[PDB]
Design a protein around this ligand. Structure first.
Ligand SMILES: Cc1cc2nc3c(=O)[nH]c(=O)nc-3n(C[C@H](O)[C@H](O)[C@H](O)COP(=O)(O)OP(=O)(O)OC[C@H]3O[C@@H](n4cnc5c(N)ncnc54)[C@H](O)[C@@H]3O)c2cc1C
Ligand code: HEM
Ligand SMILES: Cc1cc2nc3c(=O)[nH]c(=O)nc-3n(C[C@H](O)[C@H](O)[C@H](O)COP(=O)(O)O)c2cc1C
Ligand SMILES: COc1ccc2nc(SCc3ncc(C)c(OC)c3C)[nH]c2c1
Lengths: 458, 403, 173, 57, 57
């Protein structure tokens, strides 16, 4: 078969389709129109967008395809370097860092992050307890305060103190600007037009703000009487069992920036989407709130208690099904090969996995794919292989999956124990793209349950 | 005065709530050498139950066995103390709190067989060289099976045997398992009183197989000693294997439940009796009950004879120890009735067994299969497949125990 | 700080309804930590399809009237019919929790999993182990365990020398 | 008293949560605390000054 | 000092209570009587916090 292709613009081919503030949502609409596979061409460049579990299960065969750096990821390597996220699988620094840092996400490590996660989660619950009547909550803004602080503290013993700030932290402002620019670059026909001279200048200055903060974390630790037995301890001290070598200084700096960003942005997104879907599905909200009350009997949650929050877990996975917050990953053909018995590929050919469309495959999920139904995840075993991939694939899957989920589950559990929520504006979903996805402008009001306090006497 | 109960962890793990005993009485006859108790328990608004549900009971260790421990360690019951480790603890102990010895001792099992960890701990504190050799002998595979596990030899009995083992109380307590709940088959129907449940408890008692004096089963003797107005910590437990009456009250039932095995069938009987009083028609229901003697352990005789008089059941008894009669067990009676029982199962009867799972249940099962084989002139393999199919249809249910 | 030698990946999965198999699993993961592994504990039907293609996977499970426990059903079903997504690379071992009081069904689920895993490409590093609750469950559990650590020892690397009591970890008051 | 403690705990926490070598702007933080204390004790109103990086408007 | 057994038993007898009965008090009002309030504590140990033979007030 010859594969479908969306509308073209003469010599620019499909490039102008990416001249939009919401390019993943545009791609999704193209998929609905064209089906499980389409070609996307730009001047000098081709990739193939996959949307069906039928093809994606083959794309996920690591003997035939490896992780590719998409254009997006190539632009982000400018600051992520050969950190774990933007390193090729065959670069020496990938497996070395993988081996050195995987022990930071072991069960024992996770147990040891719990107390610090609780620290930040208590800060978020308190901010909301302390609002006055009729004040409201900027949801993704507060979720970013919480997630950035949580990775800062758990990973690096560093306090961004985002809940002591009225604007976003400077690191977040430059992060968002840098991601925005990488995203806008995707559509640029002539990236060296001098019209983009200012764009590049702002880009370097944002890269600088982010690296200045990295330098501070490193300086604190050198001061840190440090056991701070955490991710940074492993970066500076662990040896890869294979080579016998530790990470060098340059790579460690890329790891820190990588983990500060990957370690919070997409978790912020998930919590924001999860709260969004709960307020729009009051019966689901009540069922989740019931579990929180039932399970979380103590003044702060325990590790074992968070693991007890099954339905909350289901809520989060269902939010990731509809709106996976890192919505695409890319693969390349290790050798000539045929996809689906119908689409020949040559060695090196690129594929994009369009995760939100995979997550809407009616052959897997049934006809009601737009509904928010956490019950889909009541037995996760039931889900076929490669049908649900919000954390990517294989040895290049998300290293921080358990950390994100533990944090999200803890936080959402606390929110649901401690407050009633109101969608007071009847908020219309508006999805902001910064390569990653997040609701923009989402606001709610939260009425404290005083876990009960109203007390009189006079 | 929140006159309140420890909500020990296990009580929280099982959703056990605290509540009152409304009745407690003996079921065997005056002069029986054995005891079987009937307790009625009140349930709070939040709890509810169904026929064939179990009561989970968090028991307390009795005085005799608590005193044996405080005596071995030279401690006063009331001595307040505080533990600590840093290490996890299935033993679910209040750590970093002050708590008396006697109350610490209500968190742990005092008569589980001695474990290999326990034996090593004792060996290491033993300054009696031949006594250390003996405790270590017990670690070997064969000795451990034959002298520890076969006789249920406990750490406590070995500490009493070895008074110069320098183990100390706080190390003792920490090496013990957490106290476990005991399950009892609710012997009443919620159709008679939704907020009140009964249990039927055979009292474990005898010469200890270990050789150290007299043995008493922890929960059963705790339950036996409770009285009207005492409190009790329990929860409702529903078994994975459904053990309920058919949906249609004309579907025929065969019930086999000797001894305390009658328990859940007393609930069945009470349910059918209410359904009748509501105008529903009832089909055949055969209850095979067995005991030593009507002079001794024929539990609920009056109720079961009345039920039978009101057409709620047909009652078939077997007595093991009646002077001038052969020793009779339910399976012998079942076998006489084979033809009839098998015709009933051919017409869609449910079959139920309750009670002893180690000897009685298997023998009852073998007799049912043999009745089938004889009636339908088929092989033992065909009879086994028949029973397998009966179970897969949901018509052959067991509520049996080794206890 | 500990000493963290191996640190090889040991995933322990359980199938349990009343916790016997689940405690055995967590006990194993506790002795692994003492032997430098990087153990992980989870139910069986939660890694249904996600068997570790590296290290090893200890599988501790009971049987209920010939059937898998409630948290293991998805795993086995996935295992039974589904075989396409082969189990090659997965170096495992199976420990069985059963009761002789269950006649014809004795250890049927552990057995199923063990042998099924092998008729799909097994790296069975250590022969299955059985526990009879009706007799000497700690004997057999002990036999299988010691033999087990060594089988996997020799197989890969060589972290504990005698637990070096990475065990005694009292904590009291 | 209880409401004064509420704000005082917010000030101690901000300082507990600073990183090594960060410093404290004293009169700025004392104003966060005193304005919030009269707002809360006097009027059940939360200025939330410790959630702001600049002075409250 | 501690109150002796004889006098503790006279109290539990008068109230029909068991020594070991755990209970929990509460008031809202101050208490020179320096009682563990909002804690569970047996009767017999509560009785070691108070004077049992002062003249009746
Ligand atoms: C699903 C289920 C339902 C049940 N329903 C009932 C019921 O309705 N009524 C009922 O009475 N029981 C019932 N049981 C059994 C019950 O739960 C308890 O196990 C029983 O009461 C004994 O527990 P215990 O604490 O008194 O004795 P424990 O202290 O636990 O001691 C029990 C152990 O002691 C052993 N033992 C017995 N005699 C001696 C001896 N002389 N020397 C040394 N060891 C000895 C027993 O074999 C058993 O291993 C049920 C059990 C189950 C699993
Ligand atoms: C819901 C939250 C998360 C989502 C949806 C997400 C998603 C993803 C995806 C899709 C990939 C694969 C990318 C690719 O194939 O190009 C990935 C990789 C990665 N993730 Fe996550 N992630 C989340 C949370 C986190 C957290 C909390 C951390 C850090 C603690 C983190 C760290 C990383 C790292 C370092 C990689 C690269 C791993 C490698 O290739 O070695 N992620 N993530
Ligand atoms: C209702 C029931 C059915 C059982 N069926 C079997 C069985 O088919 N095969 C077996 O070997 N053991 C059987 N057992 C014994 C259990 O597997 C044994 O108690 C196991 O140790 C319980 O493990 P768990 O607490 O993790 O669930 C059964 C036990 C019960 C209560
Ligand atoms: C058209 O090309 C695109 C468009 C959007 C895209 N979004 C992505 S998602 C890429 C991504 N994934 C995971 C993490 C953890 C992450 O860290 C911030 C990023 C940037 N890739 C894209 C490629």
């Amino acid at each position: 078969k010859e594969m479908p292709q969306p509308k073209t613009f003469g010599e620019l081919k499909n490039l102008p389709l990416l001249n939009t503030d919401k390019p993943v949502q545009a791609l999704m609409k193209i998929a609905d129109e064209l089906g499980e596979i389409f070609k996307f061409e730009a001047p000098g460049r081709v990739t193939r967008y996959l949307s069906s579990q039928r093809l994606i299960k083959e794309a996920c065969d690591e003997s035939r395809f490896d992780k590719n750096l998409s254009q997006a990821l190539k632009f982000v390597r400018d600051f992520f370097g050969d950190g774990l996220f933007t390193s090729w699988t065959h670069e020496k620094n990938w497996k070395k860092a993988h081996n050195i840092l995987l022990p930071s996400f072991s069960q024992q490590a996770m147990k040891g992050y719990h107390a610090m996660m609780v620290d930040i989660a208590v800060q978020l619950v308190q901010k909301w307890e302390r609002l006055n009547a009729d004040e409201h909550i900027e949801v993704p803004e507060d979720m970013t305060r919480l997630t950035l602080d949580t990775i800062g503290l758990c990973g690096f013993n560093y306090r961004f103190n985002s809940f002591y700030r009225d604007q976003p932290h400077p690191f977040i402002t430059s992060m968002v600007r840098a991601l925005d620019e990488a995203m806008n670059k995707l559509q640029r026909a002539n990236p060296d037009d001098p019209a983009y001279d200012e764009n590049k200048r702002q880009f370097q200055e944002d890269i600088k703000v982010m690296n200045d903060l990295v330098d501070k974390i490193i300086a604190d630790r050198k001061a840190s009487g440090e056991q701070s037995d955490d991710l940074l301890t492993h970066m500076l001290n662990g040896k890869d069992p294979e080579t016998g070598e530790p990470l060098d200084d340059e790579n460690i700096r890329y790891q820190i920036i990588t983990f500060l960003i990957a370690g919070h942005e997409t978790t912020s997104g998930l919590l924001s989407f999860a709260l969004y879907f709960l307020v729009k599905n009051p019966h689901v909200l009540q069922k989740a709130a019931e579990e929180a009350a039932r399970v979380l009997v103590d003044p702060v949650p325990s590790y074992k208690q968070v693991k007890q929050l099954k339905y909350v877990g289901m809520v989060l996975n269902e939010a990731l099904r509809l709106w996976p917050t890192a919505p695409a990953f890319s693969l390349y053909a290790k050798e000539d090969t045929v996809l689906g018995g119908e689409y020949p590929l040559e060695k090196g050919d690129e594929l994009m996995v369009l995760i939100p469309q995979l997550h809407r495959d009616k052959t897997i999920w049934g006809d009601d794919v737009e509904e928010f139904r956490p019950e889909r995840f009541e037995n996760p075993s039931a889900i076929p292989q490669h049908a649900f991939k919000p954390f990517g694939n294989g040895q290049r899957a998300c290293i921080g999956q358990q950390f994100a989920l533990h944090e999200a589950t803890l936080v959402l559990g606390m929110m649901l124990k401690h407050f009633d929520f109101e969608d007071h504006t009847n908020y219309e979903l508006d999805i902001k793209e910064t390569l990653t996805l997040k609701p923009e402008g989402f606001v709610v009001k939260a009425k404290s349950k005083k876990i009960p306090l109203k007390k009189v006497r006079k | 005065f929140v006159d309140s109960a420890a909500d020990m962890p296990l009580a929280k793990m099982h959703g056990a709530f605290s509540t009152n005993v409304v009745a407690s009485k003996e079921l065997q006859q005056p002069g029986s050498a054995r005891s079987t108790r009937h307790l009625e328990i009140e349930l709070p608004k939040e709890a509810s139950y169904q026929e064939g549900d179990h009561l989970g009971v968090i028991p307390r260790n009795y005085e005799g066995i608590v005193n044996r421990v405080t005596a071995r360690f030279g401690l006063d019951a009331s001595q307040q103390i505080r533990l600590e480790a840093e290490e996890e603890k299935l033993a679910h102990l209040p750590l970093a709190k002050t708590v008396s010895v006697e109350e610490l001792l209500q968190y742990v099992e005092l008569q589980d067989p001695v474990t290999r960890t326990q034996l090593r701990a004792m060996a290491a504190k033993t300054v009696c060289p031949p006594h250390k050799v003996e405790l270590e002998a017990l670690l070997e595979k064969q000795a451990y099976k034959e002298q520890v596990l076969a006789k249920r030899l406990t750490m406590l009995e070995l500490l009493e045997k070895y008074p110069a083992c320098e183990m100390k109380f706080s190390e003792f307590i920490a090496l013990l398992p957490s106290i476990r709940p005991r399950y009892y088959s609710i012997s009443s129907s919620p159709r008679v009183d939704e907020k009140q449940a009964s249990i039927t408890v055979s009292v474990v008692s005898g010469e200890a197989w270990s050789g150290y004096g007299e043995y008493k089963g922890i929960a059963s003797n705790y339950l036996a000693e409770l009285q009207e107005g005492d409190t009790i910590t329990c929860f409702i437990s529903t078994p994975q294997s459904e053990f309920t009456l058919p949906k249609d009250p004309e579907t025929p039932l065969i019930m086999v439940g000797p001894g305390t095995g009658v328990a859940p069938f007393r609930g069945f009987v009470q349910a059918r009796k209410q359904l009748k009083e509501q105008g529903q028609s009832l089909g055949e229901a055969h209850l095979y009950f067995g005991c030593r003697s009507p002079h001794e352990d024929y539990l609920y005789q009056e109720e079961l004879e009345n039920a039978q008089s009101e057409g709620i059941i047909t009652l078939h008894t077997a007595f093991s120890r009646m002077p001038n009669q052969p020793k009779t067990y339910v399976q012998h009676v079942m076998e006489q009735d084979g033809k009839k029982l098998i015709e009933l199962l051919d017409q869609g009867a449910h079959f139920y067994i309750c009670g002893d799972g180690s000897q009685m249940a298997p023998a009852v099962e073998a007799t049912l299969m043999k009745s089938y084989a004889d009636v339908h002139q088929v092989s033992e393999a065909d009879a086994r497949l028949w029973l397998q199919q009966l179970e897969e249809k949901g018509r052959y249910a067991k509520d049996v125990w080794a206890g | 700080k500990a000493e963290n030698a191996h640190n090889t990946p040991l995933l322990v999965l359980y199938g349990s309804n009343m916790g016997t198999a689940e405690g055995t699993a967590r006990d194993l993961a506790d002795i692994a930590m003492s032997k430098g592994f990087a153990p992980q504990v989870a139910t069986l039907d939660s890694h249904a399809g996600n068997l570790p293609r590296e290290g090893a996977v200890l599988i501790v499970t009971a049987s209920y009237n010939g059937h898998p426990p409630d948290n293991a059903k998805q795993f086995v079903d996935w295992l039974d019919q589904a075989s396409a997504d082969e189990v090659k690379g997965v170096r495992y071992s199976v420990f069985g929790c059963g009761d002789k009081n269950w006649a014809t069904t004795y250890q049927k689920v552990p057995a199923f999993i063990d042998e099924t895993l092998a008729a799909k490409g097994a790296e069975n590093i250590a022969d299955r182990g059985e526990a009879d609750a009706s007799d000497d469950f700690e004997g057999t559990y002990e036999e299988w365990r010691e033999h087990m650590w060594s089988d996997v020892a020799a197989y890969f690397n060589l972290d504990i020398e005698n637990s070096e009591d990475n065990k005694s970890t009292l904590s009291l008051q």
